[PDB]
Design a protein around this ligand. Structure first.
Ligand SMILES: NC(=O)c1ccc[n+]([C@@H]2O[C@H](COP(=O)([O-])OP(=O)(O)OC[C@H]3O[C@@H](n4cnc5c(N)ncnc54)[C@H](OP(=O)(O)O)[C@@H]3O)[C@@H](O)[C@H]2O)c1
Ligand SMILES: C[C@@]12CCC[C@@H]1[C@@H]1C[C@H](O)C3=C[C@@H](O)CC[C@]3(C)[C@H]1CC2
Length: 313
């Protein structure tokens, strides 16, 4: 755990659930809990939260864990920023998860998108279609949720310092963002954005810590952290896997990390990261692999407002 401005305890390692398929995700979450995971990262857009919910309700009753020891996170999709929709999204998420409250609710992407069914609505240009409500509007609706004891804190994802500044400077702000969940690994180090978020008492949660291989768009030329020779060199030095090393890198930097898996053996491997330490040389070396490479760069909505990736941090 990394303590939040809330004086609350987010576990430093959690299980990611994007692309975890129906039928394998329940068991993945069950295994996760037995192996000691308590933080689980979820999203409405993942279309598997109900199955994640089944896993949690079981272990709960089964007495393998207590709900206050769990830390469950979900996100709000940009096509749902309009106030009545923020609440419909949330209730679906909450109900699927079979929870009475979320520990953190995040805005998934900063730019609001045209409402409807297309999760990614575009023009016959391929470009995305903006909507009426902004993320500020969404935050207001989200703030209501914390007042009712249904969410315990709020956070953002895929926000640049600019978006965070815009949010912290909002009139009437009732609730501050606890974390900024972004892509982070040795190819995308994120030094400035982390510096910035820490200087504001906002934690950083690193997504795609392993390089997201299984992302659909993966091209074979694309860099590959899991088979990086120099990463595997350092892993071997510690009788550990490359995945282990990639995960531990964040922890040593005070950054929360959430690797994804539905393979039981790997789910277990990915948390045996509290029994070894990378040296200073090893961090410095791994830090110097930065390439400003992003595995999740599919949206490309540079034309719309508040596009996070164009900025330096
Ligand atoms: N806020 C956001 O926008 C956002 C974006 C992206 C991701 N995320 C979150 O962060 C998590 C990040 O992961 P990702 O799925 O995007 O990428 P990732 O964790 O970096 O990659 C997952 C891949 O690694 C494989 N894998 C897992 N553990 C392994 C190990 N020990 N050895 C070898 N291979 C291993 C998995 O395969 P198996 O599953 O088959 O084991 C899966 O194919 C997500 O699941 C999601 O919860 C959030
Ligand atoms: C094609 C979609 C529409 C359905 C969801 C798809 C993916 C889902 C993914 O979680 C994601 C997260 C954020 O980094 C935003 C970008 C992607 C890559 C996203 C692009 C749009």
């Amino acid at each position: 755990f990394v303590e939040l401005s809330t004086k609350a305890k987010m576990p430093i390692v959690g299980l990611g659930t994007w692309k975890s398929p129906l039928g394998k995700v329940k068991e993945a979450v069950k295994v996760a809990i037995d192996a000691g995971y308590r933080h689980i990262d979820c999203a409405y857009v993942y279309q598997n939260e109900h199955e994640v919910g089944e896993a949690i309700q079981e272990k709960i009753q089964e007495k393998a864990v207590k709900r206050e020891d769990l830390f469950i996170v979900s996100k709000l999709w940009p096509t749902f920023f309009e106030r009545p929709l923020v609440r419909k999204a949330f209730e679906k998420t909450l109900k699927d998860l079979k929870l009475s409250y979320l520990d953190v609710y995040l805005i998934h992407w900063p730019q609001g998108f045209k409402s409807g069914d297309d999760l990614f609505p575009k023009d016959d240009k391929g470009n995305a279609i903006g909507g009426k409500a902004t993320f500020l509007d969404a935050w207001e609706a989200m703030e209501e949720l914390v007042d009712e004891g249904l969410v315990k804190a709020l956070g953002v994802s895929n926000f640049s310092h600019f978006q965070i500044e815009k949010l912290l400077n909002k009139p009437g702000l009732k609730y501050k963002p606890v974390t900024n969940q972004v892509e982070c690994h040795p190819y995308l180090t994120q030094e400035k954005l982390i510096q910035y978020c820490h200087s504001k008492g906002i934690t950083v949660t690193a997504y795609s810590p392993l390089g997201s291989p299984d992302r659909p768009w993966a091209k074979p030329e694309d860099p590959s952290l899991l088979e990086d020779p120099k990463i595997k060199e350092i892993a071997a030095k510690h009788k550990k896997t490359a995945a282990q090393v990639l995960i531990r890198f964040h922890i040593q930097r005070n950054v929360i990390v959430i690797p994804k898996s539905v393979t039981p053996a790997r789910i277990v491997e990915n948390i045996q990261v509290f029994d070894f330490k990378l040296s200073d040389e090893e961090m410095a070396t791994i830090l110097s692999f930065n390439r400003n490479w992003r595995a999740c760069n599919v949206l490309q909505s540079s034309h719309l407002e508040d596009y996070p990736f164009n900025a330096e941090y």
